[PDB]
Amino acid sequence: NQLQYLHKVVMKALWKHQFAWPFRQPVDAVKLGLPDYHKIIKQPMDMGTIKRRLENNYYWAASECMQDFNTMFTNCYIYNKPTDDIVLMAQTLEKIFLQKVASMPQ
Amino acid sequence: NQLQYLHKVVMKALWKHQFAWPFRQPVDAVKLGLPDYHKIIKQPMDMGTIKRRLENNYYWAASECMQDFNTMFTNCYIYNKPTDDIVLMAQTLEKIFLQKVASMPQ
Ligand SMILES: CC(=O)Nc1ccc(O)cc1
Ligand SMILES: CC(=O)Nc1ccc(O)cc1
């Protein structure tokens, strides 16, 4: 029920959120012109990957899925400048993620 | 039971962790020589404040306490350089926080 909740409640709300768009696919450092991205970011993560993983029964515990969300947001905070819009977008999304996690079943 | 779990399980493990020390008290931008800290960081947070809040029944829901932890970690990622040791310290602590949150009661 935990993973089903993360898929059907948490990911459903985040995926369609207006600020989701920069996070729905992996960062393409070449297309985005970010030559140092993978020098700085050790473990890339995005909602597209998390969504596919939920759909495919990839996770064993809710904790792993939660860690993936955390990694995605943290990468954003670490790589980007504090004043970048994407940082505010991540913050908004992460607050919702945490709120929903707080109501997750045991 | 949620808030009691965050206090007696989550905060107990984080407080005494070896990487806790930079997070046990508010960032003193004057003493640490960080003149731009409060220009960049809008909502300061630390484990000392969270611990006092848990002790004093400040929180209404686990979500608020969780948000405070998140804010503390996010501030760290946003303000500091990616290669700073404190960033790795925050990451380690946040992973533990999330792991414990995953086993929190409803
Ligand atoms: C998730 C993330 O950091 N995305 C991202 C970063 C910089 C940029 O210029 C475009 C997109
Ligand atoms: C929580 C935090 O960012 N602390 C912190 C940042 C920079 C520094 O030089 C010393 C401490």
- Write b or e for each residue in A64-83: b if 16 or more Cβ atoms lie within 10 A of its Cβ, otherwise e: bbbbbbbbbbbbbbbbbebe
B24: helix, strand or coil: coil
Quickly count: other Cβ atoms within 10 Å of residue A41's Cβ: 19
Does residue B44 come out as left (phi exceeding 0), alpha (psi in the -120 to 50 range) or beta? beta
**Residue B88 phi, psi dihedral angles, 5° rounding:** -65, -40
Q: A37 — contact with chain B (CB < 8 Å)?
A: no
Report the C-alpha gap between B8 and A97 in whole angstroms: 23
Q: Do A82 and B82 touch (CB under 8 A)?
A: no
Q: What is the architecture of the domain spanning B1-106?
A: Up-down Bundle (1.20)
Angle at which helices A85-102 and B62-79 cross, to 10°:
150
Q: B96 — contact with chain A (CB < 8 Å)?
A: no
Helix (H) / strand (E) element for A51: namely helix A47-55
Angle at which helices B62-79 and B47-55 cross, to 10°:
170
Residue A79 annotated as part of some ligand binding site: yes
Report the C-alpha gap between B13 and B25 in whole angstroms: 16
Residue closest to A40 by CA, chosen among A70, A1, A10, A76: A76
Residues 6+ apart with CB under 8 A from B101: A66, A101, B10, B66
Residue closest to A27 by CA, chosen among A43, A12, A3: A43
Q: What is the resolution of this structure in A?
A: 1.9
CA dihedral over B3, B9, B10, B16, signed as positive or negative: positive
Residue A2 to residues A48, A102, B20, Cα–Cα distance (Å): 19, 11, 29
Report the C-alpha gap between B15 and B52 in whole angstroms: 12
The technique by which this structure was obtained is X-ray
Residues 6+ apart with CB under 8 A from A28: none
Residue B85 Cα to ligand 2 middle (Å): 10
Query: With a 6 A CB cut-off, is A27 part of the ligand 1 pocket?
Result: yes
Q: Which of B19, B24, B34 to mutate to test the pocket of ligand 2 (most atoms within 8 A of CB)?
A: B34
Q: What angle do CA B53, B54, B55 make, to 5 degrees?
A: 90
Domain ranges of chain B: 1-106
Report the C-alpha gap between A47 and A51 in whole angstroms: 6
Q: Which of B32, B50, B74, B83 to mutate to test the pocket of ligand 2 (most atoms within 8 A of CB)?
A: B32
